Amino acid sequence: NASETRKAYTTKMIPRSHDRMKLLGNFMDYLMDGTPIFFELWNQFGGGIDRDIISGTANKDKISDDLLLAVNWFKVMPINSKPQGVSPSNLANLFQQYSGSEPDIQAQEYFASNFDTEKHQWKDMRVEYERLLAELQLSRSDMHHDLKLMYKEKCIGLSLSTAHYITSVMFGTGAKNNRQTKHQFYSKVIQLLEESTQINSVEQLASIILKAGDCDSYRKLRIRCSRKGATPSILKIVQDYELGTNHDDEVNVPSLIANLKEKLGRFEYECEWKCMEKIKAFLASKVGPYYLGSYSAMLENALSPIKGMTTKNCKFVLKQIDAKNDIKYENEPFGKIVEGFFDSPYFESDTNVKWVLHPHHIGESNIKTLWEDLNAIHSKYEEDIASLSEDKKEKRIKVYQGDVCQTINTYCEEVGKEAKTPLVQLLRYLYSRKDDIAVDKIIDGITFLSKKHKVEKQKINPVIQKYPSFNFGNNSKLLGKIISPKDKLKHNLKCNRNQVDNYIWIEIKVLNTKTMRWEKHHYALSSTRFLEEVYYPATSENPPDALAARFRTKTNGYEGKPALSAEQIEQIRSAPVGLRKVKKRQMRLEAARQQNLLPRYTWGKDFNINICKRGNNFEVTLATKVKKKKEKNYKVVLGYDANIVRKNTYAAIEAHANGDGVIDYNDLPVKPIESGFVTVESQVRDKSYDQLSYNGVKLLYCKPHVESRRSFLEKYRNGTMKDNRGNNIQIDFMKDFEAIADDETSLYYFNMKYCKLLQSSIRNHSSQAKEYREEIFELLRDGKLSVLKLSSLSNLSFVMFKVAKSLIGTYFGHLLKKPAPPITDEDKQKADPEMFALRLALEEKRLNKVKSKKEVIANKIVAKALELRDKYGPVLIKGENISDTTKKGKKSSTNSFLMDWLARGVANKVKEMVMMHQGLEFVEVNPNFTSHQDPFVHKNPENTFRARYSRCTPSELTEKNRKEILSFLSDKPSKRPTNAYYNEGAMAFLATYGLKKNDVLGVSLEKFKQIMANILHQRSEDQLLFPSRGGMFYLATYKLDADATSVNWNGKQFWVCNADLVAAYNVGLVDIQKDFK
RNA sequence: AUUUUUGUGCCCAUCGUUGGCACUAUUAAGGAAUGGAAUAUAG
DNA sequence: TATATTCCATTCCTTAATAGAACTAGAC
DNA sequence: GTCTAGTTCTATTAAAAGGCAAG
């Protein structure tokens, strides 16, 4: 039920005197310089692990003893790392020598793991551990004793303790609790419980715990058995009984005995170290005197990569074993035949160097249809061969040869329409070995080659050091605190200063490197967001109460837009442009405080201070845990449909609904509350622009810009075409340009299209790349309407940034072209620093736009869910589970387009945001068929699927539209289930308009348009509906789109709704029964 | 402990009327793709 | 126009981690 | 009375009696 997350506030360090900042910088430098020593030492400790140390351990995660040892003994690290490198062929030999036995499959798989041979190499950590014993003059027996103790205390191994605990048990010189005393006491409790196994009241249990401890109170029990530290659960029962909060609790005697019996092991030893003094002396020599806070701070940074890579590498090895087991090695000979293509004459290469073959080279499992069509040709050629008896038998055979090449070429072109184009030579080659290999075996064999290569190429994770950051806080860390708001008011009063200010102060216990002693110091920070949502004080009496979600934000119910005073508004106007935005926010904050509109924030020592030093810059982050209790009793489901070009959508469904609109969904009464599109509106004067969909101003208002662009291309409109069947055709760019220069066209589309044309001009004038340099700057940077100056968050705007990056690549590539030394970023920067800076500026702006799009889309989804939660109750947000969208088997353009979907990034932001609000839950569901299901009818109780639809006038019809409708009437079979819906849709289209296949098949687009206009004119209809893949509309049984109009399709009455709105309802309904189980 | 000028960013033919907005930070690798130049091949 | 490779660059996502809790002797 | 710097804390995964006569 308990859920935990953190919210962070980034800040700007406001510097004090240089000497004060130097003291802090020197301390941060000291911790950073120190961290690598702990990293090296912990690697040596891991190297000393052996079968004796891990004897009788836990079950871990199906990790074998061999794997646990191998991951400790051998690691992949940078070649220039201090540990000496080992060859991969020696890992098993070294393992046998250290282990005494040869490695098992898990350790063997780890050794076989792929890695980049030019950056990383295997390292022997056992040799590193030998270096520790030698360098510190440590007894092998003494270090083994300490290592064994460390394993029990979780200082080393699979499940590590915190750095703070590890530092304390290993190096702490403070008074330790006597472990034997706790062992005798826990043992006595176990004995008494066994003696009275049938007790059932806490009163009886507390009495048994008290008798075991020879005491009459928890306080006397703790002093004798657990003097220092957090209260053990067994002593908490006595304390809670003395408080009176657990008197009615149930008692599970077998469970208490079992849990107590498991802790016994930890208390059979007193943790008497034998080499800690020597190791501490070595550490003091390298990082200075032992301090729990400083050593613990450095150890946490050193430990994180070592522990994390061990966890990740163990899972990866186990994953590889299953993936390898999943391979069918029995198909290797079939794979061997297919791989034979490289040796065959069909494949031809200078060095005849091969490549990996994947299913898309044969068109996946669509080779079978090609085989049947090819067998039929052969069958007819093997049945008409008997009726020959002529000298020219070399006619028919050539007709069989030549028609085999058209069938294959045709297959490759058809498949290449909606996927990667298959390889003609490989399929020709494969047809030649038709008696040699069955077609199903060709697929199994090609699959084996591809699947084997993918599994074998997966790389091991190298162990890389961490760039460190240090934590300051109230407890178990370096001492630090944010001055509290009350202390700030008191400090200001005592200083005869203004009651409020815009700065945040921290006090941290820091080491003075000169004296090597601790000193508390004060530092200043600035963060407007922190001040608004947390820090600024609600000084006025009877201020609004603190918000349920503690943060003071608009989503949490605080608008923060109070009426400003004339002196306040003049302060904003009076300030420079660079400070006006922050001044307005500060003035607005002061107004809400004065007007008593600012809600209270409940202060606590809840914010961690993280400091990271890069150069002379300090990055300070304030983060606080946010606690949430799950609310499983959902009243509303919010479905979200993620789209790429089209708008995203949401649909809300009330569960356990009663009333006029209730629908009975498989015994669950539900009501479709509402659906909508996600838009992010920004006000400009009196109009508003949706950041998500705006494509820019029409060219009508950018004539100077277009003419300026048109003038430059004219001087470089000259361009040839290598694709003209021999002699290239010198075509004209300007004809292409005028098409996109229409006054009606959007600026972003025009700008994106112009970059592509400019790329073509440059490709056609390679020797004159330098000439375009000035034009690119005005287009991308300097121009008033340049890409950098104006762009929305619409898909087209993102594509415009992508093409601009490509054009800069083309300018640079052509600029440095020559007929061996590769061209690097250093070369480009020296060649054109301004152009290179421009490419970086585009990258930085695009990343910022992407982050902004994820946050604004996430905000809209969370706001709607919060609105529904306040109205109805707990809300479950459902998103589509989208994965593995980009594939090598698809064309580059599809993968390129698919990259901007951003469904996962938005979903990840929603999941994090959802964790901050009670009554909100987020899950992902299978998106299968969500675009074709008829919501509230499908699965209630029959499967109901329908085609997507397009709506246009007869004039707007295109040849593609005509061909698409005929394609659905083909009646050729498909492995695509959606194909039937489009077929039924096309059948419905002919019936609804009183048509027949011959009215569309073999009819000119002109004839087709007039036929539809005549029907529509008789029916007094402006537009016609036709089934189209990715069609904007869906004919729904229910009114799920607010703007939907009723229509009678094939004698059935349906609502014409936006297809995406229908989809959001469908996403909400996937496995909806499971959400109310 | 006082700096008083800044947490990070998003949108706009008019960059202001107080213009309109939004947001968990960091470390490190891995996975899957894309762009550019050129090469080989192919009907 | 397709396939495939090499080299220089890039994006979007995933998965290992960090951002401790509760306590008391002893220092004020 | 307070505050800090030091300590230990959490999973669950236990064993064996019970079930049978005269002696």
PDB file of C-alpha atoms in Angstrom, chain A residues 612-764:
ATOM      1  CA  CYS A 612      27.726  17.960  -7.428  1.00  0.00           C
ATOM      2  CA  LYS A 613      30.830  19.936  -8.390  1.00  0.00           C
ATOM      3  CA  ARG A 614      31.859  20.240 -12.054  1.00  0.00           C
ATOM      4  CA  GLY A 615      34.800  22.631 -12.362  1.00  0.00           C
ATOM      5  CA  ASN A 616      34.060  25.805 -10.372  1.00  0.00           C
ATOM      6  CA  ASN A 617      30.289  25.260 -10.716  1.00  0.00           C
ATOM      7  CA  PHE A 618      28.180  23.826  -7.871  1.00  0.00           C
ATOM      8  CA  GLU A 619      24.904  22.091  -8.781  1.00  0.00           C
ATOM      9  CA  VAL A 620      22.629  21.917  -5.706  1.00  0.00           C
ATOM     10  CA  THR A 621      19.487  19.753  -5.805  1.00  0.00           C
ATOM     11  CA  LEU A 622      16.781  19.673  -3.102  1.00  0.00           C
ATOM     12  CA  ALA A 623      14.746  16.461  -3.137  1.00  0.00           C
ATOM     13  CA  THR A 624      11.981  15.247  -0.819  1.00  0.00           C
ATOM     14  CA  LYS A 625      10.262  11.863  -0.543  1.00  0.00           C
ATOM     15  CA  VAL A 626       6.541  12.008  -1.455  1.00  0.00           C
ATOM     16  CA  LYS A 627       4.393   9.360   0.296  1.00  0.00           C
ATOM     17  CA  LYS A 628       1.242   7.838  -1.197  1.00  0.00           C
ATOM     18  CA  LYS A 629      -1.211   5.077  -0.193  1.00  0.00           C
ATOM     19  CA  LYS A 630      -2.694   3.064  -3.104  1.00  0.00           C
ATOM     20  CA  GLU A 631      -6.468   3.534  -3.665  1.00  0.00           C
ATOM     21  CA  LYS A 632      -7.503   0.266  -5.410  1.00  0.00           C
ATOM     22  CA  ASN A 633     -11.244   1.115  -5.358  1.00  0.00           C
ATOM     23  CA  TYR A 634     -11.418   2.851  -8.759  1.00  0.00           C
ATOM     24  CA  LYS A 635     -14.548   4.754  -9.737  1.00  0.00           C
ATOM     25  CA  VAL A 636     -13.238   6.055 -13.090  1.00  0.00           C
ATOM     26  CA  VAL A 637     -10.930   4.715 -15.828  1.00  0.00           C
ATOM     27  CA  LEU A 638      -9.135   7.237 -18.052  1.00  0.00           C
ATOM     28  CA  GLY A 639      -7.945   5.709 -21.346  1.00  0.00           C
ATOM     29  CA  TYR A 640      -5.221   7.560 -23.265  1.00  0.00           C
ATOM     30  CA  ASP A 641      -4.432   7.056 -26.966  1.00  0.00           C
ATOM     31  CA  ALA A 642      -0.944   8.179 -28.092  1.00  0.00           C
ATOM     32  CA  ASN A 643      -0.659   9.404 -31.686  1.00  0.00           C
ATOM     33  CA  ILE A 644       2.165  10.773 -33.857  1.00  0.00           C
ATOM     34  CA  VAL A 645       0.797  13.338 -36.359  1.00  0.00           C
ATOM     35  CA  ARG A 646      -2.796  13.303 -35.079  1.00  0.00           C
ATOM     36  CA  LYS A 647      -3.684  14.652 -31.626  1.00  0.00           C
ATOM     37  CA  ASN A 648      -3.518  12.412 -28.535  1.00  0.00           C
ATOM     38  CA  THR A 649      -6.894  11.557 -26.970  1.00  0.00           C
ATOM     39  CA  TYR A 650      -8.460  10.599 -23.621  1.00  0.00           C
ATOM     40  CA  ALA A 651     -11.769   8.975 -22.693  1.00  0.00           C
ATOM     41  CA  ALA A 652     -13.264   8.712 -19.178  1.00  0.00           C
ATOM     42  CA  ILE A 653     -15.501   5.743 -18.167  1.00  0.00           C
ATOM     43  CA  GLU A 654     -17.467   5.717 -14.889  1.00  0.00           C
ATOM     44  CA  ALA A 655     -17.599   2.280 -13.225  1.00  0.00           C
ATOM     45  CA  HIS A 656     -20.493   1.139 -10.964  1.00  0.00           C
ATOM     46  CA  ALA A 657     -22.546   3.814 -12.749  1.00  0.00           C
ATOM     47  CA  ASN A 658     -26.335   4.129 -12.230  1.00  0.00           C
ATOM     48  CA  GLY A 659     -28.612   6.422 -14.225  1.00  0.00           C
ATOM     49  CA  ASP A 660     -29.785   7.361 -17.720  1.00  0.00           C
ATOM     50  CA  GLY A 661     -26.614   6.592 -19.732  1.00  0.00           C
ATOM     51  CA  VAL A 662     -25.573   3.337 -17.990  1.00  0.00           C
ATOM     52  CA  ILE A 663     -24.361   0.527 -20.304  1.00  0.00           C
ATOM     53  CA  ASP A 664     -24.210  -3.065 -19.093  1.00  0.00           C
ATOM     54  CA  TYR A 665     -20.662  -4.261 -19.808  1.00  0.00           C
ATOM     55  CA  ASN A 666     -20.506  -7.975 -18.852  1.00  0.00           C
ATOM     56  CA  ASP A 667     -22.296  -7.271 -15.530  1.00  0.00           C
ATOM     57  CA  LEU A 668     -20.331  -4.093 -14.785  1.00  0.00           C
ATOM     58  CA  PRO A 669     -22.516  -0.965 -15.067  1.00  0.00           C
ATOM     59  CA  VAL A 670     -20.394   1.709 -16.827  1.00  0.00           C
ATOM     60  CA  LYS A 671     -21.158   5.193 -18.234  1.00  0.00           C
ATOM     61  CA  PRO A 672     -18.973   6.893 -20.876  1.00  0.00           C
ATOM     62  CA  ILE A 673     -18.360  10.279 -19.125  1.00  0.00           C
ATOM     63  CA  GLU A 674     -16.359  12.211 -21.756  1.00  0.00           C
ATOM     64  CA  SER A 675     -13.627  12.107 -24.432  1.00  0.00           C
ATOM     65  CA  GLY A 676     -11.294  14.820 -25.699  1.00  0.00           C
ATOM     66  CA  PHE A 677      -8.112  15.783 -27.520  1.00  0.00           C
ATOM     67  CA  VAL A 678      -4.914  16.800 -25.747  1.00  0.00           C
ATOM     68  CA  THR A 679      -4.044  20.391 -26.693  1.00  0.00           C
ATOM     69  CA  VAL A 680      -1.575  22.816 -25.117  1.00  0.00           C
ATOM     70  CA  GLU A 681      -2.890  26.360 -25.647  1.00  0.00           C
ATOM     71  CA  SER A 682      -0.615  29.410 -25.413  1.00  0.00           C
ATOM     72  CA  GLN A 683      -2.331  32.810 -25.555  1.00  0.00           C
ATOM     73  CA  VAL A 684      -0.959  35.388 -28.021  1.00  0.00           C
ATOM     74  CA  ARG A 685      -2.776  38.736 -27.743  1.00  0.00           C
ATOM     75  CA  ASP A 686      -6.447  37.731 -28.294  1.00  0.00           C
ATOM     76  CA  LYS A 687      -5.784  34.369 -30.022  1.00  0.00           C
ATOM     77  CA  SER A 688      -4.510  30.997 -28.717  1.00  0.00           C
ATOM     78  CA  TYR A 689      -2.105  28.525 -30.418  1.00  0.00           C
ATOM     79  CA  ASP A 690      -2.113  24.755 -29.688  1.00  0.00           C
ATOM     80  CA  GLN A 691       1.631  24.030 -29.216  1.00  0.00           C
ATOM     81  CA  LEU A 692       0.978  20.356 -30.140  1.00  0.00           C
ATOM     82  CA  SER A 693      -0.681  20.979 -33.542  1.00  0.00           C
ATOM     83  CA  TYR A 694       0.297  24.463 -34.832  1.00  0.00           C
ATOM     84  CA  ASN A 695       2.128  24.246 -38.206  1.00  0.00           C
ATOM     85  CA  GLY A 696       3.073  27.963 -38.383  1.00  0.00           C
ATOM     86  CA  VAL A 697       1.678  31.048 -40.156  1.00  0.00           C
ATOM     87  CA  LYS A 698       0.688  30.745 -43.810  1.00  0.00           C
ATOM     88  CA  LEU A 699       3.212  31.976 -46.437  1.00  0.00           C
ATOM     89  CA  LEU A 700       0.734  34.820 -47.038  1.00  0.00           C
ATOM     90  CA  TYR A 701       2.404  36.766 -44.192  1.00  0.00           C
ATOM     91  CA  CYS A 702       5.994  35.680 -45.027  1.00  0.00           C
ATOM     92  CA  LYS A 703       6.378  37.047 -48.587  1.00  0.00           C
ATOM     93  CA  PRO A 704       9.686  38.800 -47.834  1.00  0.00           C
ATOM     94  CA  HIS A 705      10.878  35.484 -46.373  1.00  0.00           C
ATOM     95  CA  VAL A 706       9.656  33.375 -49.323  1.00  0.00           C
ATOM     96  CA  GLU A 707      10.958  35.832 -51.957  1.00  0.00           C
ATOM     97  CA  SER A 708      14.305  35.960 -50.136  1.00  0.00           C
ATOM     98  CA  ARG A 709      14.381  32.113 -50.112  1.00  0.00           C
ATOM     99  CA  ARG A 710      13.181  31.966 -53.774  1.00  0.00           C
ATOM    100  CA  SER A 711      15.911  34.420 -54.869  1.00  0.00           C
ATOM    101  CA  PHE A 712      18.791  32.301 -53.432  1.00  0.00           C
ATOM    102  CA  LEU A 713      17.552  28.952 -54.841  1.00  0.00           C
ATOM    103  CA  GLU A 714      17.230  30.632 -58.298  1.00  0.00           C
ATOM    104  CA  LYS A 715      21.004  31.284 -58.417  1.00  0.00           C
ATOM    105  CA  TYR A 716      21.371  27.540 -57.685  1.00  0.00           C
ATOM    106  CA  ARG A 717      18.208  26.087 -59.320  1.00  0.00           C
ATOM    107  CA  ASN A 718      20.501  24.203 -61.788  1.00  0.00           C
ATOM    108  CA  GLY A 719      20.386  20.468 -60.862  1.00  0.00           C
ATOM    109  CA  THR A 720      20.813  17.067 -62.628  1.00  0.00           C
ATOM    110  CA  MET A 721      19.095  13.669 -61.991  1.00  0.00           C
ATOM    111  CA  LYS A 722      21.086  10.371 -61.931  1.00  0.00           C
ATOM    112  CA  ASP A 723      17.748   8.469 -61.982  1.00  0.00           C
ATOM    113  CA  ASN A 724      16.796   8.848 -65.685  1.00  0.00           C
ATOM    114  CA  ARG A 725      17.591   5.376 -67.181  1.00  0.00           C
ATOM    115  CA  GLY A 726      21.050   6.338 -68.508  1.00  0.00           C
ATOM    116  CA  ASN A 727      21.513  10.014 -69.507  1.00  0.00           C
ATOM    117  CA  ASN A 728      20.463  12.016 -66.392  1.00  0.00           C
ATOM    118  CA  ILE A 729      17.663  14.645 -66.813  1.00  0.00           C
ATOM    119  CA  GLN A 730      18.581  18.160 -65.616  1.00  0.00           C
ATOM    120  CA  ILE A 731      15.288  18.922 -63.752  1.00  0.00           C
ATOM    121  CA  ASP A 732      14.321  22.213 -62.061  1.00  0.00           C
ATOM    122  CA  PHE A 733      14.247  22.836 -58.268  1.00  0.00           C
ATOM    123  CA  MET A 734      12.125  26.006 -58.763  1.00  0.00           C
ATOM    124  CA  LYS A 735       9.153  24.036 -60.121  1.00  0.00           C
ATOM    125  CA  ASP A 736       9.374  22.080 -56.836  1.00  0.00           C
ATOM    126  CA  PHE A 737       9.846  25.356 -54.905  1.00  0.00           C
ATOM    127  CA  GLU A 738       6.779  27.171 -56.313  1.00  0.00           C
ATOM    128  CA  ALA A 739       4.618  24.185 -55.284  1.00  0.00           C
ATOM    129  CA  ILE A 740       5.529  24.796 -51.601  1.00  0.00           C
ATOM    130  CA  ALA A 741       5.456  28.613 -51.907  1.00  0.00           C
ATOM    131  CA  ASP A 742       1.632  28.793 -52.040  1.00  0.00           C
ATOM    132  CA  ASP A 743       0.284  31.586 -49.772  1.00  0.00           C
ATOM    133  CA  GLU A 744      -2.005  28.913 -48.234  1.00  0.00           C
ATOM    134  CA  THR A 745       0.896  26.675 -47.125  1.00  0.00           C
ATOM    135  CA  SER A 746       2.174  26.680 -43.485  1.00  0.00           C
ATOM    136  CA  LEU A 747       5.603  28.223 -42.703  1.00  0.00           C
ATOM    137  CA  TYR A 748       6.935  25.100 -40.917  1.00  0.00           C
ATOM    138  CA  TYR A 749       6.006  22.850 -43.835  1.00  0.00           C
ATOM    139  CA  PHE A 750       7.564  25.369 -46.230  1.00  0.00           C
ATOM    140  CA  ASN A 751      10.670  25.715 -44.046  1.00  0.00           C
ATOM    141  CA  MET A 752      10.984  21.921 -43.638  1.00  0.00           C
ATOM    142  CA  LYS A 753      10.472  21.372 -47.394  1.00  0.00           C
ATOM    143  CA  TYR A 754      12.964  24.157 -48.301  1.00  0.00           C
ATOM    144  CA  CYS A 755      15.713  22.472 -46.234  1.00  0.00           C
ATOM    145  CA  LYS A 756      15.175  19.293 -48.293  1.00  0.00           C
ATOM    146  CA  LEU A 757      15.342  21.245 -51.616  1.00  0.00           C
ATOM    147  CA  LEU A 758      18.438  23.091 -50.392  1.00  0.00           C
ATOM    148  CA  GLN A 759      19.943  19.683 -49.580  1.00  0.00           C
ATOM    149  CA  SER A 760      19.289  18.574 -53.193  1.00  0.00           C
ATOM    150  CA  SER A 761      20.796  21.798 -54.574  1.00  0.00           C
ATOM    151  CA  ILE A 762      23.960  21.176 -52.452  1.00  0.00           C
ATOM    152  CA  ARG A 763      24.130  17.508 -53.507  1.00  0.00           C
ATOM    153  CA  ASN A 764      23.928  18.759 -57.128  1.00  0.00           C
TER     154      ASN A 764
END
